[PDB]
Design an enzyme around this catalytic site. Sequence first.
Site, PDB file in Angstrom:
ATOM      1  N   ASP A 143       0.821  -1.212   0.000  1.00 23.25           N
ATOM      2  CA  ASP A 143       0.000   0.000   0.000  1.00 23.25           C
ATOM      3  C   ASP A 143       0.856   1.263   0.000  1.00 23.25           C
ATOM      4  O   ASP A 143       0.641   2.171   0.801  1.00 23.25           O
ATOM      5  CB  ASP A 143      -0.940   0.002   1.214  1.00 23.25           C
ATOM      6  CG  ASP A 143      -2.030   1.067   1.121  1.00 23.25           C
ATOM      7  OD1 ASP A 143      -2.264   1.614   0.024  1.00 23.25           O
ATOM      8  OD2 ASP A 143      -2.658   1.357   2.160  1.00 23.25           O
ATOM      9  N   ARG A 147      -0.774   8.821   1.408  1.00 24.37           N
ATOM     10  CA  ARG A 147      -1.461   8.829   2.693  1.00 24.37           C
ATOM     11  C   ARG A 147      -0.718   8.025   3.756  1.00 24.37           C
ATOM     12  O   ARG A 147      -0.964   8.190   4.952  1.00 24.37           O
ATOM     13  CB  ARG A 147      -2.881   8.278   2.533  1.00 24.37           C
ATOM     14  CG  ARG A 147      -2.942   6.812   2.140  1.00 24.37           C
ATOM     15  CD  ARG A 147      -4.356   6.406   1.760  1.00 24.37           C
ATOM     16  NE  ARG A 147      -4.606   4.990   2.012  1.00 24.37           N
ATOM     17  CZ  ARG A 147      -4.434   4.014   1.127  1.00 24.37           C
ATOM     18  NH1 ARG A 147      -4.002   4.277  -0.105  1.00 24.37           N
ATOM     19  NH2 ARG A 147      -4.707   2.763   1.475  1.00 24.37           N
ATOM     20  N   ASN A 148       0.190   7.156   3.321  1.00 26.28           N
ATOM     21  CA  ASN A 148       0.921   6.301   4.245  1.00 26.28           C
ATOM     22  C   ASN A 148       2.358   6.775   4.460  1.00 26.28           C
ATOM     23  O   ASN A 148       3.177   6.054   5.033  1.00 26.28           O
ATOM     24  CB  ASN A 148       0.893   4.854   3.734  1.00 26.28           C
ATOM     25  CG  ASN A 148      -0.499   4.246   3.799  1.00 26.28           C
ATOM     26  OD1 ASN A 148      -1.294   4.596   4.671  1.00 26.28           O
ATOM     27  ND2 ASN A 148      -0.808   3.347   2.870  1.00 26.28           N
ATOM     28  N   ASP A 164       3.031   3.903   7.730  1.00 19.63           N
ATOM     29  CA  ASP A 164       1.931   2.976   8.017  1.00 19.63           C
ATOM     30  C   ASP A 164       2.161   1.630   7.335  1.00 19.63           C
ATOM     31  O   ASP A 164       2.605   1.580   6.188  1.00 19.63           O
ATOM     32  CB  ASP A 164       0.596   3.557   7.533  1.00 19.63           C
ATOM     33  CG  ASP A 164      -0.594   2.656   7.862  1.00 19.63           C
ATOM     34  OD1 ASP A 164      -0.839   1.666   7.138  1.00 19.63           O
ATOM     35  OD2 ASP A 164      -1.293   2.943   8.852  1.00 19.63           O
TER      36      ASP A 164
HETATM   37  C1  LIG Z   1       0.173   6.594  12.978  1.00 18.24           C
HETATM   38  C2  LIG Z   1       0.366   8.026  12.460  1.00 18.24           C
HETATM   39  O1  LIG Z   1       1.715   8.423  12.862  1.00 18.24           O
HETATM   40  C3  LIG Z   1       2.140   9.742  12.865  1.00 18.24           C
HETATM   41  C4  LIG Z   1       1.372  10.883  12.493  1.00 18.24           C
HETATM   42  C5  LIG Z   1       1.887  12.204  12.524  1.00 18.24           C
HETATM   43  C6  LIG Z   1       1.076  13.379  12.125  1.00 18.24           C
HETATM   44  C7  LIG Z   1       0.019  13.276  11.150  1.00 18.24           C
HETATM   45  C8  LIG Z   1      -0.756  14.406  10.766  1.00 18.24           C
HETATM   46  C9  LIG Z   1      -0.490  15.671  11.349  1.00 18.24           C
HETATM   47  C10 LIG Z   1       0.551  15.784  12.312  1.00 18.24           C
HETATM   48  S1  LIG Z   1       0.919  17.339  13.049  1.00 18.24           S
HETATM   49  C11 LIG Z   1      -0.631  18.082  13.478  1.00 18.24           C
HETATM   50  O2  LIG Z   1       1.625  17.094  14.293  1.00 18.24           O
HETATM   51  O3  LIG Z   1       1.537  18.129  11.998  1.00 18.24           O
HETATM   52  C12 LIG Z   1       1.319  14.663  12.693  1.00 18.24           C
HETATM   53  C13 LIG Z   1       3.228  12.308  12.957  1.00 18.24           C
HETATM   54  N1  LIG Z   1       4.010  11.249  13.326  1.00 18.24           N
HETATM   55  C14 LIG Z   1       3.478   9.981  13.282  1.00 18.24           C
HETATM   56  N2  LIG Z   1       4.300   8.908  13.664  1.00 18.24           N
HETATM   57  C15 LIG Z   1       0.155   8.109  10.936  1.00 18.24           C
HETATM   58  C16 LIG Z   1       1.112   7.464  10.074  1.00 18.24           C
HETATM   59  C17 LIG Z   1       0.970   7.514   8.671  1.00 18.24           C
HETATM   60  F1  LIG Z   1       1.879   6.904   7.904  1.00 18.24           F
HETATM   61  C18 LIG Z   1      -0.109   8.195   8.065  1.00 18.24           C
HETATM   62  C19 LIG Z   1      -1.070   8.841   8.880  1.00 18.24           C
HETATM   63  C20 LIG Z   1      -0.945   8.803  10.306  1.00 18.24           C
HETATM   64  N3  LIG Z   1      -1.954   9.479  11.042  1.00 18.24           N
HETATM   65  N4  LIG Z   1      -2.808   8.830  11.866  1.00 18.24           N
HETATM   66  C21 LIG Z   1      -3.561   9.830  12.329  1.00 18.24           C
HETATM   67  C22 LIG Z   1      -3.144  11.037  11.777  1.00 18.24           C
HETATM   68  N5  LIG Z   1      -2.116  10.826  10.950  1.00 18.24           N
END
Ligand SMILES: C[C@@H](Oc1cc(-c2cccc(S(C)(=O)=O)c2)cnc1N)c1cc(F)ccc1N1NC=CN1
Length: 284
Positions: A143, A147-148, A164
């Site tokens: 995948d 988005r990942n 992800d």
């Molecule tokens: C599990 C989650 O991990 C993370 C998200 C963000 C992160 C994601 C979006 C925004 C911000 S921010 C507001 O701190 O700039 C930080 C930052 N660090 C991570 N390790 C994730 C991994 C991915 F590969 C794709 C999407 C997400 N998510 N899950 C929920 C939201 N994103």
Amino acid sequence: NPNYCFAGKTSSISDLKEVPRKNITLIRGLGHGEVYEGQVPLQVAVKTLPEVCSEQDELDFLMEALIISKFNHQNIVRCIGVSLQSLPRFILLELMAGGDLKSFLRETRPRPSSLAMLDLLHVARDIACGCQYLEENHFIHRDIAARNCLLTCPGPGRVAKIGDFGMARDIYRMLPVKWMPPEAFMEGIFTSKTDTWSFGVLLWEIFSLGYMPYPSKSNQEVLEFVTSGGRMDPPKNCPGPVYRIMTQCWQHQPEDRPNFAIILERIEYCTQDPDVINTALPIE
Ligand SMILES: C[C@@H](Oc1cc(-c2cccc(S(C)(=O)=O)c2)cnc1N)c1cc(F)ccc1N1NC=CN1
């Protein structure tokens, strides 16, 4: 406790680094189970397991923890540890302050109010390096999509990482059809060349600045389109050398598609080419 094998090495829940719950503090939500910014001070993204879940959800969560903890590469998000001995259960990840790549592209695209081709080529190289690491360790991501992917920070020094592994975890034990090669959704055959095709689609995502692939097409329309030889047009203002990497990633025969070593070489050549990196991105 189920085992996990990566690169011919076997690990179990016992190998995960359990972080004392008292040492973990949640700061705010990041979206979603739910994910929070936290502290252990080390900044972390905290993935949570809903307390209301099936025994299967719990096995899925454990397996995700094992998978990420066993990777060691600069373009794959680090796992700081887990907190599985308290509820709700946590997986603690490297906090990627730049957020997910798809939203970054949408939010940072050039406007009269900034990004250049080199920024995009650097993101592409970063993820290709992560994919090469997976390929050389015989792990199929299944995948690879914007988005990942995550970014370390909003600014020029950002590094892109794969963040992800939910699809791979599911298969180890809603389909991303717009990212899949013909043999995948037809025969359910997966190899490293599966990820090559997907990387081509990610490349399109990157140079389109975050558009959904195959604009205006539904999943089944894409399935029939790709199966009959149809391919996406170049993104707006996309340099020919970059588009040609995409079209090579989308060769019908898996054997005709480049491995990631070759993809990295081609991305490197694009980055050297003044005519490529001097090309202005569209301003909406
Ligand atoms: C599990 C989650 O991990 C993370 C998200 C963000 C992160 C994601 C979006 C925004 C911000 S921010 C507001 O701190 O700039 C930080 C930052 N660090 C991570 N390790 C994730 C991994 C991915 F590969 C794709 C999407 C997400 N998510 N899950 C929920 C939201 N994103």
